[PDB]
Structures are given as structure tokens and as C-alpha cells.
Symmetry: D6
Subunit: 135 residues, 12 copies
């Protein structure tokens, strides 16, 4: 359970670096060849950092309204000593463009490798609501 | 490229065992603790074989109409010697309940481990069209 | 955990007596003053057995098609020695009126009392899909 | 009828502490392990206080417009001396974001335990309109 | 409570004479100048028996499928010794044109007079679902 | 026709006391145990004055725009000397939230008793448009 | 009232000649230069018999199912000794293409002249449901 | 053709008195017992001046924007020397609530009598767009 | 008026040759370079006979059900001695694919030239319903 | 081709006089008995100048925003020496009520005569988008 | 114009080989590395013959109903002596799944190369209606 | 691969000249007889520069908000030494009319010729989202 709690802790560091808009910390968690599927990419497989960079510069660095996030039913597969995978449900509570509280759901998969003693993310898949909020 | 072609070959064996309705071969490719996200599970994370078993018994063992499948733009991450991940776009051509040809798209992620010298699947995530066909 | 497994076992006996259409076993699990909220009652609070009796006589005793049910994330509150409450997510896999497999979800609460040494159900609440199937 | 009037009185204290935005009184009525089903949680079972805390901080502490609430057809099950359950219909009259009066309906179940001589809430289930108002 | 139970009993005789298709008994319960509002009359006030006669001749005398009816929360006003009024919610369980069980709701008011020692109906108002079933 | 004109006159006094917002005159026309069905109550049977009080305090005491009302095809049943019933179509002409004239229709039933020499209202049923105007 | 009852009687002869499919009697009631507005003419003013002839030949001579018609609130203007006008609401009860009873409403104006001692129809206007039934 | 041109001229005087908002001239053209069918009356037959008075006071006396009206294909029936009927298509060109030109269509019937040497209107029927404009 | 009646007569010969399915007579009325706009051509300008030929071969030669056509408000421009233009509204009464009478409207323009002593059609424009019927 | 270029040139003079709002030049191109079909006339045949005059006075004399027009695939029929007909597709590029560029399509027919040595327009037919722009 | 007529002729040979279902002639016109965009491929770029092969085997070899095709406004770019490009509008007239004639439109681009003395197709792009017909 | 990288480089120069609003550089890349299919042209084939000029003058020269563009899966056909064709998927990230980031997809084909030693564009085809952004 010690190695599973380590993957959980490192995944929580990713999620709070994203919602802080901290792109310089996000870039240290991600591999340069990272690939992803997500609702914003319209069914295409994205590669590298530059597609995601646009949302840090146009939302996450600029926003100020309160947000709360719940992680439900996490499951971890540990795949030897170099590799791991985590899957969870995410609920986000947020304030819309006219002051009403709202909720949305996503389903997320993250794939982790340990090159050079540090855990880094190599592939990501998301379903459900967009991460760009529906305000 | 040799190890990447091996993951491609093993992923093609999974896809043809599914569309043949060969549940006894499917059960040798999958780990007993396998987890999944897919459109049929309504946003929930499924564990084990028994949710999928229902579709082999009520479609895949019984169907006879022609189907064709195209795999587009595959990408493989090889994660040491025990682990790998593959991501691809899938297009399926099928005949509906009244003889008309149709097309649908999915986006798929599969996570592979090599316990006891044999590659086996430990997590799967699907977006887009259901695998239960829209006939 | 022994008393929690007992409530789980007794709740599984209720669910299989319903999907067998066994109204004479259902009547031994329920209290005569049982109350319920469910989608079929259109927002009203029902009392007694006679509202439910209609669905045993017009579906559950007559149906023959295959059904599978998954219970997800159960939680039990044990409230002294006489009382308990259980909450769970239910997924049902079923065949429609033209041979296609389908899925639906409900959320369920059940309240249990132990009069005369036997566990019996006194209140029930359901949300999501109707239990009368969407075939 | 004396013990039933006591559960009614305590349920009315909960409802007025919520619509006053009095989170410090709400926290004394609820057990720390409380679970719930409600429309805002999107079909998931919530545990603990922190999901509900967001609506006290972003609505109930800040609102000033007039509200009226009617409780219809309450039913109480008393389950020995430590335990009780209550079920009722709730109608709420409220003013929208442009000054028009509106109405909405919910159906609610609440499960009560008496640890250490004080009644506290251990499970809650809601159907119908959200508690976050449709202004 | 004796006179209220008499109005309840006489109202149950009306409802079962209607669902039996017994127009010759219905004609003995109704005053010749009876007026009504109901969904089938498109917002108009009907007078006399001949508008209702059409539904006995084209449904109620001819139907054979099982029907169940629940009366909820009845209230009676007794207005001296010659007059009374009753108000109730009606739920009807029925089988559709393809064998599926269904539910519908109406709200009903009935006004009763005692000319010549016999109770007879002088005005009726219905809201909600039509009495002609939605099969 | 003299007693019928008296019920008509008293019903017109009710309608103008409501559209003046005169809740202290409305309370002298109504019995303390009065019951009603209306579109604002969402299919439920309301009892007493406090549900209606909210619309006097949040509209009828505060409004200033011109309104005109037409009563069509009234019918009266006189039920001995203590009791009467009246039924009519109501058309209301009103100005919306942006200065355009509009029309709406309701169908209404009212039940009258004469305790202590004064006519008072004991039950009411409404269908069609809400009495809260669609501005 | 004698001359008004004569216009009513002659208008009832027209309506029953139409629903019998008796085009040879209809042609004796109508002036050769008769004009009309009705839903079937798509906003145009029709002149003469030949537009209406098509509905006698393709429905009214061929139909066999039961129909009932109610005339509501008739008003007559008598305009000297040669001329009259009548206006009424019409409700029609009919059976659809699969055996269910249905209702529809129209509003109708008819203009009458007495050339050569016989009343004949010179202009007609209809609003609401089409006369061609919605089976 | 002289008597037909007289009815045309008098009908044009009505139409321009209405669009000027000249209710004191309108009241001299209409009979005190005039009846009408029109889209604003929701399927009911109106009698007298007071329903129409509301639109003079809340639009026609207050408006200032340009309007143009075309009368198409008029037909006149002259019914002895005391009575006449006219039927026509009306097209209205108008400016909406945000400055765009718009068009709408009605179909109209008007019935005229000559009491005391002066032509006056006794019945009116309208179909298509409301006369209260769709701005 | 003699030359206008000649264009009317020749236009009626075209319309009855079309609804008879008489393509060999249609080909004698049309110029070889004829152009047209119509709903079936999806906004394109068609040239020559071969686009129209398909509807003679697949409907007009094969149909048997009764059809009636009304021509409304025709207008003719005569343009010297060689040339003419006609414009009219067309109403068609027809029986649908399940035996119900239906109506549809078109607006039509036709341009006529007299080469070699015989009138022939050189351009046609249609708006409204398709001539291929909505059965 | 010289006479065809003359009709093209004169048709371009009409189109630019319209979009300049130059009603005094438009009136010299049109014959006083001109007829038209267009979307703004709701399926009716218009005659003379006064229907079109309203759009010069309420838009074309007042507008200032940039517009561009493309004429596609023109075809000309020359019908002796006094008469001609032209048909074309028209695309219009325009700025909406909030500054965004938009496109729309019409199909147009125009009929030309040469009385007194000057070409003038006698009939016009339009389909597709209205000439009043959809800003 | 000789080389342009050659590209037109070769493009007509492709279109008739497709609608004959002649896959062995289609394979001689296409380059082995051919790429395409079309509505059936859901926004993806297809490569090679095997995606198209499915529609020959499941429609074009099996169909028997009459089809007609019009090519509108073709444009050819000739790019030295080895290469050419053609663009056209295509209208297809066809019979649906219940015997009614229908029309649909596509816009098509085709790119041609002359390796080894024979013209062959290297890229294709289609917009508008699918080539799999909407029967 | 050198000649393919040259076509890629020249295609990237076109795309950045367009999103800079640099119409004087765009005019040096395009042939004077260039043809195109695109969503803005409503299914028509455009020729020359003047249709596109309108979007430079009314958007691209005036806009200031941030935009990002991704080119996916490019494919090049090189057709001797004078000619080439390129096909790709384009994703655009942009800010809407109220500050929210958005995504859209197009599929694009471009045909290139080398007259006088300089590459120039002769035909273009686009599917999917309009190039005028959906803000």
C-alpha cells in the first residue's frame, strides 16, 4: 500500500498544479513525448505540451473564483518497479458566469514511468465533461 | 521497432478474438483483476470478466453479418521490459438491422504487463461509439 | 464485518426473489406497513404491498429473457442490534423488445428492522431508471 | 405519538439550520461518517461534510430573498429506542433572479440514530428538484 | 366520521361502475343537469350525459385488460345534511397497446347533493392525465 | 335567479379582492380549513391560507400595471339553503415584462357554504394557465 | 326566437348532410357562387362547389366509424327578413386509425340569404381543427 | 358595382380608424351587440366593445412606428338592401422591436347591416396572425 | 382578352399532359434549350429534358390515384406578338400513401415564345411544395 | 452575344440601384403594372411599386455597412427584338447586427420588354433567402 | 480543349464503373497509394483500396433500382503534361426504400497523374451528401 | 523528403499569411484563376480573389485575440517536377465573443503548380468548420 499511496500523492500534485495554473511545475511532471485523448481534442490523439499550454495562458493563470474537487473510487495497478497506472472518477464543484454553483463529472486514466529516479506521465485519457469549465 | 510490432500483433489478436465471439481466448489475454471505462458502463469503473461475458453470450457468439475494422495512427509507449501502453483510433464498417452499410468511431487505450513470460491486459479505456453496434 | 455481510446476504435474497417473480417470498421479507419512493409512483409515497403486486402479476412471473445485475460500492450503517441501513448503485444488463443488449442505472436505499428474530424491510427509496425495464 | 413528534421537531431544526446557512449548527446534527444521494452528486454516493460545505459558503450564508417551505404527508418509522426513519414531500416557494415567484418539489428520506443521548443523522436520500434553487 | 365514510363508499361505487363500463348504473348516480370540466373537453364546460356516453360505448363496455387504481389523501367537506364535496389524488396502473405496465395521475373534485333521500352527483372537475387511457 | 345573482356578486368580490392584493379581505371570504388544487401546487392538495399568502406579499400588494378580466358562461348549482357551487371560464388581459398585451385562460370551480349567516369558501379547483401571470 | 330556431334547424340539416356524405343534398343548401375560408385551403379564399366535392368522394361517402358532434354557445344575428348569420363552437368525438377515441374543436361562421323563398348559404369561415379528421 | 364600392369604402374607414387608435370613431362603426372570433380570444366567442378597448388603450393610442397594409382579392355578397358581407386577405408590413421590417398575413370576414340609414358591423371573424403585432 | 385566353388554354394543356404522364406530348410543348428552377433541383438551374424525364418514368406513367388541381388568380403579360409570360397560384388535392386526402401549394412562372407558328416554353420557375407529391 | 451583354448590363444597373436605395432610379426601370413572387410576400402575387417602396424607406436609404454580391452562371433567352428573360444565382456577403461576416443565396428570374425604345421590367420571381437581410 | 475533354471522358468512366459496381475496373483507374476525404470516413484521411471495397461488396454489386446522375459546371486545371485536376457539382436522382424518387448533391475534387502512359487517380475529396445513398 | 518539406514550408507560409490578414502576400501565393470549395460558399465553386478579399477586409486585418493552430497527419503527392498536392487535418484553438477558449476542426486539400520557377495555388477544397471563426 506504500507504493500505491506514492502514486496517489504524485497524482494529487498534478491536479493542484493544473488548477493553480502553474505551467512550469506541470512541465516537470510530464514527459516531452506525452500523448492524450480528451474532449477538447475532438477525437484526435494529441502529442507534446503545446496544445495544453493554450489553456494555462487563457484560463488557469487568470481565474480567481472558488473551485472544489472530489476524487472517487481510485484504483492503482503497479507494474514492476518502473511503471504504474491509476484510474478514478472526478467531481468538480464550481461557480458559473453569473454566480450559481454547478457540478460536472469526468473519468480519467493516467500512465506513469520512473526514468532517472523521478515519476513522469507518458499517456492520459479523459471522458465526460471538458476540463475547460462550463461556466 | 521489434517490441512495438509485438504489442501491435498482440492487440490485433485481442480485437479479432472479440469480433469472433471467442470468450475462451479473450479470458487468456485478460488479467483476472482487469479494470475498464467504456460507454456501456454509464460512467462507472468495472472490474473483472463478468460484465463483458454478457455481450459474448448475447451478440458475439450469435452474429453472422460482415464487419470491417480500420486501425488509425497507433502510438506505443514501452515502459522498461515488463510493461507497455498502446493508443489508437478505430473505425468500424457494419451492416444495420435493414441491410444498409454504416460507420462509427472509437478512441481506445490499452495497458499491458508481462507476468510469467506472457503479455496480459490490466486496464482499458474507451471513448466515442459503443462496441455494442448501432444496428 | 460479520453483521454487515449478513445485511448484504439478506439484500441479495430480496433482489433475486424480485427478479424470479417470487411474490410469496417477497411478502415474507417486507413489513405489512412498508413505505416507498420510486420512479413508477410519480412523486407520491406508497404504503403496503398492493402497488408492487401489479408488477409481479404483469411482468416478473411471465418474463423469460436473460438479465444480469451488478451491485457497486455498497455502504452499511448498523444502528444498535435491532436496526440497519444499506445504500448501493445498481447496474442492470438486459435484452430489449428486438434482441439488442441494453444497460441502465439506479441508486437505492433500504431500511431494515429485526422484529421477532427475523430481518424485515420497513422503508425503501429509489432514483434513476425505473425497475419496470425500458425494453 | 410523543416520540414521533420529537423526530418531526428535530427534522424541522435541520431544515431551518440549512436555510439560515448555519453550517456550525448543521455540523452538530450530522454524524462525521454521514452518506448521501442527491441530484447535485450526479448519481454518486457522497460521504462526510465537505461536499455540502461548498453550498453553505457560496449560497446559504450570502442569500437574502424570501423563501417559504411546506412539508406534506410525513411518515415516521421508530425502530426500537436508538433508531428512527422519516419520509416526506417538500414544496419550496422562492423568488427567481428577476423577481417572479416560483415552486419546486422534492421527495426526501432521513435516517436518525441516538448515540450518547443526542439524535444525529447517518444517511440521507433526495429525489426531484435540486436543493440549489433554480433562480 | 360515519357520514364521511358514506361519501367515500358512494364515490368508490361511482369509480367501479365507470371502470366496469356499467352506463346504466352510472346514469343512476348522476343528476340529469350534471356539469363537468375534464381534459377530453378541451377547456369547455360540458352539460348532461351524452358527451360521456361515447366513452362507455367505444372503450369501457369493450375492454378486457387488467387495471388497478389507488386513491390517495382523500378530504371531505360536509355542508349541512343535504350536501358534500370530496377531493382526492388518483393513480392508475394499466397495460399499454404492447403489454408493458404504465402509471398515470389525476386530481379530482366531486360535488354531491341528496334530493329524494338518494345521493347524486351535480358537478365534477378533473386535472392531470385524461381518463381515456394512454395505451 | 335572485340567489344565483347573490353567488355571482360574492364571487366577483373574491376576484377583485385578489387582484387588488387585499389579503385582509381575502381572509374574511375563506374558511380556515379551505382546500385547493391549482397549477402552482404541482399536483398536490393544499390546506389553509399560508400557501396563498406568499403571492399576496410577493406580487399582488406590489404590482401597478393594468389588468382586465372576462368571466364566460357561468353556471350555478344551489344545494338547499346553506350551500352552492359555481363554475366559469376566465380570460385575463395583461401587460408583459416588456409592454406587450397578452391573454391567458383558466377553468375554475368554487364551493360555498353559509355558516353563521355569512357565505364562505371551503374548496377551490383551477385548471389551465397559472394565476401568477406569465409576464 | 321562432326565426332563430329556424336558422338553428337549417344549420343542423347542413351538418348532418355533410357527415352522411350526401353531396346531392349539400348542393341544394349552397348558393352556386358560395365562398369560403377553411384550414384545408391553406389561407386562400375558395369559390364554388368543386373544391369541397373532393372530400365527399374520398371520405364522406366511404366512411363507416361512429362520430358524435356537440354544438356550443350558438349566437344568431337576424338582419331584416331576407338575411341571417350564425356563429358557434363545434366539438367532434371520433375514433382514430387504431380504435382509440379522440376530440377536436372548430370555430365556425355561416351567412344565410333567402332567395326564392328558400334559405341558402353564401359564405362560410372556419378556424381550429380541419374538417378532414385527424385519424 | 356602386353598392360594392360603398362597402369597400366603409371597410377601409374601419381599418384606418383601428390603426390610428381612434376608439371613439370605432365605437360609431360597431353595433353594441357585435360578436367576434379572433386569435387573441383563444377560441372563445367575444361579445361587445370592452375586450377590444384594452388594445386601443395599451397599443393603438400610443404607437408611432410606420405601418403599411395591403388588401388582396376582396369579395362582396350584397344581401337585399339592408345587409352585406365582405371577405379579404390582409398583408401588414411593420417594424419590429429592434428596427427590422417584417410581414404577416390574416384572413378576415365582416358582416354589415344598415339600421337607421347608417351601415354598422354586427359580426367579425379573423384567422392567421394576431392583430396585436409580432414585434 | 382573346390572346390571354389562348395562353391560358395552352398552359392548361401542359398541366394535364404532365399529370397524365404523357412525356411525348410534353416534349412537343417544350423548347430543346428550356431552363428551370424548382424545389427538386436543390437551388441549381437545370437545362434540357433529361432531368424531368426521370419523374415521368418513375411516377407519372405508373400512378392511378385521384388528383384535383385549382389555378388561382392568373396574370398574363403579352409582349408583342411572339412572346408572353403567365404567373399563377396552384393548389393540388391528392390521396397519401395510407388513403387520407391532403393539400399543397406552389407559385409558378412560365415564359412562352412562338417560333414557327407554334407556342413553346423556354423558361420555368417554381416555389413552394415539390411537384413530386408528399404522399 | 452583343444583345445578351446589353441585358446583363441593364440587370446590373437594377441590382446596384436597389442596394444604393435609389428608389427614383428603380421606378424608371420598372413598368407600372410589374408583378412579383418573393419570400417577403408570403406566397401571394404582388402588383405595382408600393409593396417594395416600404423597404427603400425603412432599410436601403438608411443602411451604411459594407455588402458584396456575386452573380453565378447567368442564362439569357432573347425572344425576338422586343423581349428577353434572364436567370441567375445570387450570393450576398454582408455584416450582421454584431459585426460578423455572413453569406446567403437566392435564385432569381427577370422578364424584360422594350416599349418606346427603353428596356423595362414586367415580372420578377425570387426563391431562397429574403432580400431583406438576415442581420 | 482536347486534353480537357480527355480528363472529362476518363472521369465519366470512373463514375459509371462505380455505379455499375465494377470493382475490378475501379482498381485499374486508382493508384495503389490513393488517399481520400469523404462523409463516410467521419473526418479521417483514408489510404488505399480496402475501405472502399466494402461498399462494392455490400451495395454496388447487389443493387438493381434506376439511378440518374447530372454533372454541373465542371472546371479542369491542366498542370504540364503529366498532371491534371477536375472539380464539379454532382446531382443524383434515385428511388428510396419505398418507391419514391429523391435528389441529393455532392461537391467533388479529383487529382490525376499519368505514370507509364495511363491516367490514374492519386487523391479525392468529397463534400455534401454521402455516396452511400439515403434510401 | 526534401521536396515534400518544401511543399510543407510553403503551405505554412500560406496559413500564417491568412491569419496575419496579409492580403498582399496571399495574392502572391495564389494563381489569378484559382478555384475553391468551402463552407462559406454554400455548395458553389468560387473563382478568383474577390470572394476571399471580403474576409481580409472585415476580420483578418482587424482582429487582435490569440489563436493557435495544429496541423495533423499531413500527406503529400509529388506529381513530376511542376506539380504537387497536400492533404491535412487542421485544429484551431481560439477565444470566443466572451473570453472562453474553443476548438474546431477542418479537412483541407491544396493543389500546387510551379509556373515561372515559383510555386502557386490553383485549386482548394475545405470540409468541416468554416474558416470564419465561431465566436
Amino acid at each position: 500500500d506504500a507504493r500505491k499511496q506514492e502514486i496517489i500523492k504524485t497524482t494529487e500534485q498534478l491536479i493542484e498544479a493544473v488548477n493553480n495554473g502553474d505551467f512550469e511545475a506541470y512541465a516537470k511532471i510530464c514527459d516531452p513525448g506525452l500523448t492524450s485523448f480528451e474532449p477538447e481534442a475532438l477525437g484526435n490523439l494529441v502529442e507534446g505540451m503545446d496544445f495544453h499550454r493554450f489553456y494555462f495562458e487563457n484560463l488557469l493563470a487568470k481565474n480567481s473564483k472558488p473551485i472544489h474537487t472530489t476524487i472517487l473510487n481510485p484504483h492503482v495497478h503497479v507494474i514492476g518497479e518502473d511503471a504504474a497506472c491509476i484510474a478514478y472518477i472526478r467531481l468538480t464543484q464550481y461557480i458559473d458566469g453569473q454566480g450559481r454553483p454547478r457540478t460536472s463529472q469526468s473519468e480519467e486514466t493516467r500512465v506513469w514511468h520512473r526514468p532517472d529516479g523521478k515519476w513522469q506521465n507518458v499517456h492520459f485519457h479523459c471522458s465526460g465533461a471538458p476540463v475547460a469549465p462550463l461556466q
